[PDB]
Symmetry: D2
Subunit: 316 residues, 4 copies
Amino acid sequence: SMDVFWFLPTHGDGHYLGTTQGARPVTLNYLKQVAQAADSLGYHGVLIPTGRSCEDSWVIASALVPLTERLRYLVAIRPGIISPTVSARMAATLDRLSNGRLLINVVTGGDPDENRGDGSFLSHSERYEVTDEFLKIWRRVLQGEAVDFEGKHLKVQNAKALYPPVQKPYPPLYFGGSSDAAHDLAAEQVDVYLTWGEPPAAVAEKLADVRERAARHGRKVKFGIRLHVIVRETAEEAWKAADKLIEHLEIAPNLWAGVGLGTALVGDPQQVAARIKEYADLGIESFIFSGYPHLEEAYRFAELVFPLLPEPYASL
Amino acid sequence: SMDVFWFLPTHGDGHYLGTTQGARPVTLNYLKQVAQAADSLGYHGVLIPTGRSCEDSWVIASALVPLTERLRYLVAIRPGIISPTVSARMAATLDRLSNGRLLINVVTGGDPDENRGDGSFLSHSERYEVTDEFLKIWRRVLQGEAVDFEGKHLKVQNAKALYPPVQKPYPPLYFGGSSDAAHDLAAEQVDVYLTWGEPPAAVAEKLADVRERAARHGRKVKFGIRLHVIVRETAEEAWKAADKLIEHLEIAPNLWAGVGLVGTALVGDPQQVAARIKEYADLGIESFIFSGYPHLEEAYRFAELVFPLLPEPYASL
Amino acid sequence: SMDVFWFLPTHGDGHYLGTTQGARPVTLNYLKQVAQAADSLGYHGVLIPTGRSCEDSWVIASALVPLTERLRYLVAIRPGIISPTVSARMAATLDRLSNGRLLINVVTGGDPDENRGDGSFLSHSERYEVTDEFLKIWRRVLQGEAVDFEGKHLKVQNAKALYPPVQKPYPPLYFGGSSDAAHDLAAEQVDVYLTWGEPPAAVAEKLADVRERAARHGRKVKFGIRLHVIVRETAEEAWKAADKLIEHISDLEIAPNLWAGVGLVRGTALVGDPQQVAARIKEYADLGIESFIFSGYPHLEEAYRFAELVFPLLPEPYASL
Amino acid sequence: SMDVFWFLPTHGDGHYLGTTQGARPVTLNYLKQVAQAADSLGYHGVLIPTGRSCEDSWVIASALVPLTERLRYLVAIRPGIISPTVSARMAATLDRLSNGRLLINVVTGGDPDENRGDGSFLSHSERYEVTDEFLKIWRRVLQGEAVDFEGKHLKVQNAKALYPPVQKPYPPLYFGGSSDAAHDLAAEQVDVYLTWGEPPAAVAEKLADVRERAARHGRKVKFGIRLHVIVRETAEEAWKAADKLIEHISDETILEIAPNLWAGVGLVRGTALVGDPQQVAARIKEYADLGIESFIFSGYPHLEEAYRFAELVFPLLPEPYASL
């Protein structure tokens, strides 16, 4: 098993970082270009970032659903800024219109200035307490249950979502975060645990922790990894583009941390495929890639790396 | 002027009320049919309801925006269940993707059980206090201000919506409600005051009240009305269709209150229906939000029968 | 087995015949409405008429293909006004973009004024000779053959269509016409034989003729019927609607529930309650008719009316929709 | 006064010529990608090729029209393989559905084997006689006339197209061809005369010739040029990209004829502009100084190069492209 995702640049696109030269603004037309590109090329889905620097994820995901056939949308929900019941009704509606193509990314929100701008004044420990109570109401409501919940942060009485989702029991929950409270939350409620691109040894340390905590609850979770990718026909062109990307550091074999100014895979197709094989051998089944620009690099990655990956990507 | 809206049946559609016979389930395909029908027929916009009994308004409005050209979308926001900054960012994004075709309907939420199901436990006065503080942040945030606000219910620090809306200063605010707090809220913040279908005397009393309260805030508000409509070629067919609607009450000339058994409706021939519309416009009402069962067929019926009797541009479409 | 089609009014739509009152002009928006209506309601396909009084069938069908999911399109080809090779490439392209949703309606062209307006000057016998040679080149080219053909009317040397169709051996061929030469052409080359709405005994006679000729060619052809439909909740409302359709025509039930009023302006129609309409459909189906191409005025509302009133009385999958 | 077109690769796309490696087959999805790219990037229109090696132009242009807003479509008609009345009705329908975005490319058909494959057996002189009679019927039919015409090759009686086009008197006629009979036909009937990418002096001779013949008919025609384009940030990368494009071309199936005018693409099917953005814009400025107002560009791959040309060359071109 392997699910290869791409990325929707709802915060802006371009060729280079740290400059407005060659910048591509977020428009409906260009978002359609990237989304329909990932759709026809055979990517499993697309990840939509969230935050103050982005256009709204739910508006954009809903706008692209009727313009695409098979592509799934990994949409972020932010507990603490919306009612869990309302969030569940939004998820059910979009999952129904998409015929079961919705995936949920649970985002706790790190930036305190951004959280206060949204009206949330919570400590780090309180944010995960809200997410824990949020997901409990959200998951139970989407399964047809009339929820009565009174927790430390959230309180609902007779919460109902009258329109059932297509995916059962609910759209899959993706979650990232390296905190101790985050790993407990992932092991208890989520379906796929996400991590940034770290060296294989450090990733295995994170995975084994979540795997053990989930076993204490009698659960098993799948694993995914997030990686930028600069892949070229030869290794020389790839590193030249990585330098060119940050004009205006190799922490592991072909693992470049320049985008963190998380990390990126830089090299020829065999090198890039070998690092993917190393991550897959650890138990990772989801891969979320990105590249600059997001339109051209979606074709670049599909034409250079897909033939070296397992089916169905080998046949695309 | 005059803006004639239609209605998206996101709570279900059909031929008859109080029965599942002849029901049409809400699907993406059928919502496209109604929306694209209103788009090509020349309706100014379409109203999307909200509530526990509906699919989410924002998902549906966003899905239909890139499938329509001119049609506007009157989407409901519910203060008290979402952060004002986030709601403004949702509004800005949909207004930008739609190229300035977004209209916002401020809905406070009447059902106390439904409000408790969403996590809101507020008295009647408290719901309007939240809406007042919600709108103050929402309006200023969409105007490019980094807002610091600390009220009784809401508090934001450095609230920003980085992507400006297309419509300036922000998408127009439509608002309904007959409470004392509702008329005060409308007179101070909203752009269009909405009312259900009542006899002209009852509407004129409401319109005169808001108009006087808005003058105390140095503003003028436009007025709109929400009305179901059962119009046929002759008056006999219209009343027979009205009777068949509730098989499984005329409180005013051609004003039928049968739909309130599950507001009111205009029933009659085109001249009778057009005459009641002229009466409402003579009171100062410029927006009309109509509906009919089924919403696809009746949208064509109203357009072909009543549009020629309305002012331009509807007379020429 | 049963295929229920609808109709795209590419010549104009409306509520009444013989008047411009309540007319709906052919626009892209209104064509999308009808096509997407038939798509979502579950009709097998939609028939697109041809002629000088219509917009071009190929432009409209190609425009609606990416806007619909399952709906098939019965598009007309006119032998004698286009090269067979070029027509084959058009069919191949539209069938590929549509993922195998193209159906071909072979129209020989009856009106002599319209045929001369297009530059075709052929007698009745010559008209079918051209169609016969056209279909042979068309069918062979779409099967990957480099065709050398030199006939009485058409001549090609090394005719090739490089892009194969999705449907094999080629998009299904529909054909109508009751003449002796038409039945010989249908029994030999086409896939579905079509007929207008006649009384069941009159339909059965044509079907028996084509069925007898096709057995001599070692083939079987399916049969379809073209029928207008005015179905209402009660029989009284249905006949009142039929009267209103032809009210504005200046100076009728030729069979049980078979009304020939639509044959005034430009075949027949089924008028009655849902059980009466479903029974006449069962009679036609008992004769061997497997395709039904229905129409109604207006084409948007009546597509819903027929689906909500008649589909539950038809075989699956229409009974469950 | 400049209209910049792109190209729809309805015959196939890819990264390199002479190889199937990295090839992109013609699909509805990929055609949507290129067409919607040119639409949103601000290209005036897109050219759709014709021939036995292509998918049908009319099906593809009609399929993409309802998926685009401003992009125009330059679609080929081939006289001799379709009735003029039918061809005119097709044009009228597509021009109505597109709200006046249809452009017509008059293609006479050069390949004799391909013409015989379609049933056309005509000499070079006869081919232009058919086109001349075809366009006369086509133009008049689209203007509401019931046309009675009896020529050497075509004959119509009461030819009518009942649905008028949006663009008056008819969708603009584009025409290419360097033959002596071709220049006579262009000077008499068409709106825009097209030429392949030749040195500016050779182009000036063709344009001045057509200009003079059109004055003998009391008309003026606009001029356009067809050019491939390989533009990179620096001149070195552009020539390196040009060399890599024809690396895999077999010598069995077998170059800078002018400053930045490279004839390597003509080894399969004309010429290309190769260089940095300033070099490419300067050669465009030269052709425009001759009187050329339409420019039809293409690049491999056609999706990526549509963005590349718009991001590198549009700012150096006149308005409105300079602000896009």
